[PDB]
Design a protein around this nucleic acid. Structure first.
Length: 104
RNA sequence: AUCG
């Protein structure tokens, strides 16, 4: 308890709890990709999104899901490149069966 | 950008 104690492991554990994250590997991933403090910066920004009530998730049908609101942060984030944004949650957990020629 |  001196500065913020933004240890990325603690951070990832914090985000997932606060967003009630279903797929906590993702919420921890944001941490890994953007940075330990950068994730906490988002925690403060989530309150800013909270006061405005903004979120459109991948489907748009569900609107303002707790974790999803934080997902909005990757779009609402001021200083992060969109490539990282796509790389984090837009890939989700997709893998490749040798792309086309899956020699089984 | 949270529909497995």
């Amino acid at each position: 308890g001196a500065m913020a104690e933004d240890s990325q492991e603690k951070v990832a554990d914090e985000i997932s709890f606060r967003l009630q994250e279903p797929k906590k590997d993702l919420i921890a991933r944001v941490v890994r990709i953007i940075g330990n403090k950068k994730a906490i910066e988002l925690l403060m920004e989530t309150a800013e999104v909270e006061q405005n009530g903004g979120l459109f998730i991948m489907n748009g049908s569900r609107r303002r899901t707790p974790g999803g609101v934080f997902l909005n942060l990757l779009k609402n984030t001021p200083s992060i490149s969109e490539e990282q944004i796509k790389d984090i949650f837009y890939i989700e957990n997709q893998k490749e069966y040798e792309n086309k020629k899956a020699a089984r």
